[PDB]
Amino acid sequence: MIDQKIFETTLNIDDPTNFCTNVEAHLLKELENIYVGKCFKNSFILNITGVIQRSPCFIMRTNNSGRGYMHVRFSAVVSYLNAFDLIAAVKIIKNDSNIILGESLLTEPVTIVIPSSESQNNVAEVGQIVPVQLANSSVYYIPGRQQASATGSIFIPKHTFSVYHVQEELTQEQALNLTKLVNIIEMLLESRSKKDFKQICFFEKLYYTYSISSDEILDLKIWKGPKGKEMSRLKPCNVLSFLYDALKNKNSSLGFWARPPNLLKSSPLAYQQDQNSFNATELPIICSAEVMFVTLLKEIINYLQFINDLCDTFNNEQLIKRHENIWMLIEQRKI
Amino acid sequence: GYANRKAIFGLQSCIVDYYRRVSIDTRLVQQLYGEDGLDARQLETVRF
Amino acid sequence: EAGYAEIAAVQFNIAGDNDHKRQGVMEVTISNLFEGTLPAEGGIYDARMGTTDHHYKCITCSHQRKQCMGHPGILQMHAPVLQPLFIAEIRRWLRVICLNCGAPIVDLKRYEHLIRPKRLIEAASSQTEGKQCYVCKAVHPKIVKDSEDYFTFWADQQGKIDKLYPQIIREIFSRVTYDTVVKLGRSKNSHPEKLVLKAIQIPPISIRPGDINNVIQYLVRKNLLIPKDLQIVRGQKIPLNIDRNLQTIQQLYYNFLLDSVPSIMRRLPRKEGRIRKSLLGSQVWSISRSTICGNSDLHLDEVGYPISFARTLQVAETVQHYNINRLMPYFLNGKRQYPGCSRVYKQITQSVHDIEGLKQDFRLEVGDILYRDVVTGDVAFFNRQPSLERSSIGVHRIVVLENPKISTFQMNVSACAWYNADFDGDQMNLWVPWSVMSRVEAELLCSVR
Amino acid sequence: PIEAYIRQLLVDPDVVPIVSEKKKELRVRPSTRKEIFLINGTHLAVPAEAPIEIYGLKLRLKTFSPQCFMRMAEIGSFSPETLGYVASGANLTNFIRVFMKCVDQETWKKNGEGVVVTTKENIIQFTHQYIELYKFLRSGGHSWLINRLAEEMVHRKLDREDQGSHEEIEPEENIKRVIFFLKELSTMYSVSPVFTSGYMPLLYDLYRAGYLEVLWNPVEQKFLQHAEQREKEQMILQQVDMKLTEVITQARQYFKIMEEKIGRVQSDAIREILTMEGKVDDPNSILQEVIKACGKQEAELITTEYLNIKKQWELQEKNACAHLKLVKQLRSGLQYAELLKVLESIRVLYKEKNNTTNWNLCKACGFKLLCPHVDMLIQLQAAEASYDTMRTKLMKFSGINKEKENNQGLIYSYFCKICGEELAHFIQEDRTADVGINSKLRVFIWQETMKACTFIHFGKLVDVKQFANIAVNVCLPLVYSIYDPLTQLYAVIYIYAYILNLIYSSQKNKEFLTITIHGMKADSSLNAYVTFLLEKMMQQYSGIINQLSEITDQWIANNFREAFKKIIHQNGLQGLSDD
Amino acid sequence: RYAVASYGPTDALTGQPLDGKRSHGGLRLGEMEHWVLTAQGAMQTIIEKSHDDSDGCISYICRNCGEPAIYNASHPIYKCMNCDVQADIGMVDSRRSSIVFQHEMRAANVNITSVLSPRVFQPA
Amino acid sequence: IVESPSICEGFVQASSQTLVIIPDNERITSNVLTTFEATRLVAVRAQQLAINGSTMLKKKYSSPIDIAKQELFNRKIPLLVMRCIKVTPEGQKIVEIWNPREMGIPLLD
Amino acid sequence: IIGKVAKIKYIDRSVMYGFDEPAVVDAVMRPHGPNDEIFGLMRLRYERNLNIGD
Amino acid sequence: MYADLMTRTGQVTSLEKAGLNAREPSNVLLRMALSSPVQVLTDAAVDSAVNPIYGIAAPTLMGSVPRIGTMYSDIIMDEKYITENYKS
Ligand SMILES: [Zn+2]
Ligand SMILES: [Zn+2]
Ligand SMILES: [Zn+2]
Ligand SMILES: [Zn+2]
């Protein structure tokens, strides 16, 4: 993601006299020179928003240099990349007989180590760009590097899902916290809305779990996308307005919640039931509404960002048709 | 030399702080250095 | 990128297997020293642990000889080895816990009122032989120390004798809970499991430049003999060759650490030891020594200093806009006249330039550092050993003696009272401060007035 | 994928210990030592691997404090899993307490709070809940939430200590006139008047000025005049010293240019006459050089050329060319891969490829750009060059040779002859690789070499022990490069190949001791010696050869040939040490 | 008589000058002279002599765990092999004899963790 | 039961501190520089002048030491003396900020 | 004063006169040691008068 | 200074190793330097001793300098004075 963070550090001032003339300007300039664009303290710093607190410019005591130092506590906008995250712009750099290295072209500088032992990623072309699914491993943030080290693989849509048994609901504060998530949803959704629908529906249909031959323009007056399969007589529930009404406290969120493969993932809708009619091969996960809401909203964020990045990178037909062997492998694995 | 080194290693931690006390990093050894707070080099012999 | 910092506190702990595995940068696997002109990788001389030559750099920090402090390695022992420094501690832990279930034998609550340093000592001091354990129904044997070496332990169960190998000691200590350790006074970081090592730490190359290397090589070679999959259980008979090999390994490690305390710990104690010769004392540059002499024409705060020594010791003057004109005559003299200069530091190249190989510059660049000769009027620290009073080191104004035949440090006879000196053959040190910070403090604080 | 291994990796954390009973059906072993409970409630432990039966499990709900979470956020470099673990522990979040609470009933009781499960399938439910709990703690969710709340709480704390938190009038007439005196003296002495209530800095200023008599005696005017006078002589002496030193500087410049133009002999002679005149460092050396040893014009050109060099130096000071800043980024170290391209961007400004003996010049401006040894030093630094491999390569740039025997100052460092920069330093040779790479194989090579002496003919007396020691030092490192019978056969092959190298070396260099075989002529073909040595080796070591069922006469002859090549390649032609 | 230089032969282990005139090394500022300089308050003189002129160097210590770290401005290395992801390296003015002294104690299975002085901030 | 070590304990990094400046009217330390403090001020200023050289001294001197001494004597030195009084367990660092431009200089010249 | 190189091309293990006062080479000889080998023996003489500090 | 140091704990301590261990039990580095570093180092490790850095020997053994004399009071840069008076 892209989020705010607070760091503490110590800066060495070679010439205290010149430095103290414009302390704030010099401090911001030096912090931007040192920390912007590097990995530090399990994060990758993008921007230095400001300095909250700082120390007086002390004079170093243990040597005869007359040089100075200052303790700086500064707030910076950084990026933390999680597991199972979608990156829709990963250009392959190294494809040798041992390992595959690709580089991302997004706001999260990350090198992707793709194991060359799976039929999806075994055959590719150097210079081709491809969306990448991150494995269930922590992203390495080696200090001082210009990039984040993380393993990944070409994103094949999966056939499984999970069911959450929620027995405890939200409070007012626990919903005001998720207000930020729904704000992120609506921002990404406006970003989707400000762009033409042809490639939107193309990518959404191509990354649908099943084969979508029929064309539909399903509308919710807030989210637009192609309609797919249903599940008998079950009708989805929009999690966005669901959480809004739960904050308004005119609805109960208890029960079974699910995000099946046939469901429109990037849409804010999901399944809720009073008893599991889902033919899931995994046991239901007993939990509260905090974990299920945060996971579902994070998944919606991830898929919306994935579609937005796909449409941002691939602008014309040449880009989409240059990599059509990846897309062919994509159709080859859908039901 | 045997007595000088042992005396210093026991006494060297005593440092005059900002209250003119003599302490060991937190712990008072003297409430006031020499009980008068003066320097040995700045003393005059005067009759009463 | 690395900020300025100071050490506020130091914590002392026992280094276990995990500490050695984390802090180590490489694993020693071979007994070979050098593959030609470079150290063999995987050996005890491997460059990943540091460098001491100009022929190669440290693989870890990518520094030269001067800037590399060394990094530690790991040697995975085929059999567990006891820690030489804490053998006595091990004995204590062998006299308080049961050897079959690990539960404490003495009542912990009987030592609650004691201070935690002495709980274990005064709990193991009392006899514990023959006491019956409350949870496994086992009789505690007596832990007798082998009189022929500093590490071997025997267990005596009413005449039944057994040898407690380090693997057995580890299996006994690992069964002890942290509750027992805490209620016995010792901290969680002082768990007895750390007293038995299977991955010893190879000290960095900066510690053993160039006998200690011979001991380490012997230890590695004899460790390679022990089978890697050797298993020891209590009551098992052991072939004599393996027993003597384990004896040799443990003795080699003990002599590597506590040889008759060449060993690591022998470097510490005495006057010529690490602490009193390298830390509390110091060998320094830019210092002079000569026999002192009487001179009644010098002031009490002045010292007569030979011109030959004045041209050897230097004073570091930083070039600025105010002293460009004063320092310039020093620059033009060089090493061919007095007063002159011998060496110039440039900010432009961030390096050091000679004065004889550099004669194409009309003047100096602002920011340069000029190392000029010592002149009359400079301050110098003037010392006589032993330094009993704090007037034994004083700052005098230098009077340079232009006579080339004078080799003594001349001073007024009335100045001898500061140093308890006389002219029967005494010698006194003299070093001229060159740093601006040290030169300021010599004039203001350390002046003999 | 049986339940046992799942319960096994459940054991890893300090949480979820084991209650063990001798009469049950579950059986798992730990990966490390584990502190466990039992029925009858005894707290014991188990070693790394030991068969332990599982009566049930208990996850402890460890209660931390918010101060610990604040301290970690102050550190601000922890993984989200640990932060969430502590936040759930410190009642700051409600995740672990929710994923748990699968209790069958309160069937067991001890000190700490926790979830207890002692059944056959509810233990499976406990395992599933635990795995999904850490899956949530590791996933994309719970990472935005915990990091955001930690940042918010740190910011709120900074607000708590930031936003929620944070006289003299007139002196006396005596001190009024004293401060008037100090005000008038400020423009005259290093004194600045302050207005402290305690009058104390004023007292120190008066004491330092050496005149404390203002306080009682109204005689301040004489000290004012004294200060004016003293400042006057100070200024006079300062100006006199400045004039003297500028005269000295100009005279030294004149004499330096004289030295560089007319030579050391004439310049030092003129120094001699000036030295026995008391007028050195005074520009009357101009008059001396006018009427002595040359004409007035040859000194006029010296004066004009001095002024020309002064103008050139002033122009160089006026330089603001781009190249200058580039040189700075070349002299900061800073990531070799970047200084390499800095050197690339600088080398485009060279003029005539300036290999040696003079500076590189900047085509853009005209002044000096970069000495060649700096270019070579940068190339070596970016080219993983060791100090010794860097000190020796920068030896063609070595400074002034034995031309100067010494300048009375002992130096341990080389300097560049082009500019004077320090190339490197040399004090002593390291000599630690002298020890390169078991008394048994050494003793074997030594003993087999001593046995070989029985068929070797030396043309003079030879120390047979010294011969055997040299043979060990040659053969042993080579045998290690290749106590089983095959290692012995290799050692023998190398000893005989070393003997063949000595015979060959004595045939090639007549200064070497003549070495042959008993009954063979010194001029015998090398093939005759090879044939004899192979036959001798096969006869003498037939017992070792017969233990090695895979070794053929062809294999021995090939390894003997390769051993002989390796010895010649590593050691060259070797002789053994008139009358 | 003796007077040597600003630099010269150096001890391999401690990084200090050699002993006496015979080895062309420096002269000793022993234990009793640091007592006098401390008594006089001459602390910048001790830095000049015992650090700048004898063996003074730069030691890098990680804040998060107190173990020695690895820093290199050129060929960027910023790492710590005890925490490895959360390293906060700060430089401390030390001398080579002390680093050798600390390594020898670690060679004796004694863990040496240095607690760096905490950051101090204004309340504004 | 005192159990296995956790992550709450075992921290090596000391917590950060808040600089508590004693108000001017509530100060206890002397209004006179000690010889140690004056010497440190002069040395620091001289070294910084050797680095930068930018000064507002009206007179001219050819040495950083002399310029620093005259700056201290003329009360034009851009430095402050912070006298650390106490480090409180809760985190505060109570100090005293003194201005050498309004204290008595113990030196002589 | 004494030239000495070890054949590896060559490394210089020379012996240098490290004394401030100049000497005069008084006697040079090449005797044979107990091991029947050449070693270099040089005698340096100093003209010493009585000077200040004796 | 002798009497006040030797009698600050309520008992007459000595100027030897035993006396230093009573007045200053936690100053291991100073205690190591005095008499026997090996014995003190072994006891410090088992006791998990924490050694604050103060005095002379503790900063000296760690390569730093004591906070004494000129180093006792640290110097901070006058931010307010420079901005109005100096220029960049
Ligand atoms: Zn290194
Ligand atoms: Zn028992
Ligand atoms: Zn140019
Ligand atoms: Zn660390």
Automatic annotation (TrEMBL), chain A:
It comes from the Viruses. This is D339L. It comes from African swine fever virus.
From TrEMBL, chain C:
Transmembrane segments: none annotated. It comes from the Viruses. Residues 193-449 form the RNA polymerase N-terminal domain. Belongs to the RNA polymerase beta' chain family. Part of the viral DNA-directed RNA polymerase that consists of 8 polII-like subunits (RPB1, RPB2, RPB3, RPB5, RPB6, RPB7, RPB9, RPB10), a capping enzyme and a termination factor. Catalytic component of the DNA-directed RNA polymerase (RNAP) that catalyzes the transcription in the cytoplasm of viral DNA into RNA using the four ribonucleoside triphosphates as substrates. Forms the polymerase active center together with RPB2. Part of the core element with the central large cleft, the clamp element that moves to open and close the cleft and the jaws that are thought to grab the incoming DNA template. This is DNA-directed RNA polymerase subunit. It comes from African swine fever virus (ASFV). The chain holds residues 2 to 484 of 1450 of the full protein.
Automatic annotation (TrEMBL), chain D:
It comes from the Viruses. This is M1249L. It comes from African swine fever virus. The gene is M1249L CDS.
UniProtKB/TrEMBL annotation, chain F:
It comes from the Viruses. Keywords: DNA-directed RNA polymerase, Transcription. It comes from African swine fever virus (ASFV). One of its GO terms (cellular component) is DNA-directed RNA polymerase complex. This is C147L. Belongs to the archaeal RpoK/eukaryotic RPB6 RNA polymerase subunit family. GO terms for biological process: transcription by RNA polymerase I; transcription by RNA polymerase II; tRNA transcription by RNA polymerase III. Part of the viral DNA-directed RNA polymerase that consists of 8 polII-like subunits (RPB1, RPB2, RPB3, RPB5, RPB6, RPB7, RPB9, RPB10), a capping enzyme and a termination factor. The keyword Transcription applies. The gene is C147L CDS. Component of the DNA-directed RNA polymerase (RNAP) that catalyzes the transcription in the cytoplasm of viral DNA into RNA using the four ribonucleoside triphosphates as substrates. GO terms for molecular function: DNA binding; DNA-directed RNA polymerase activity.
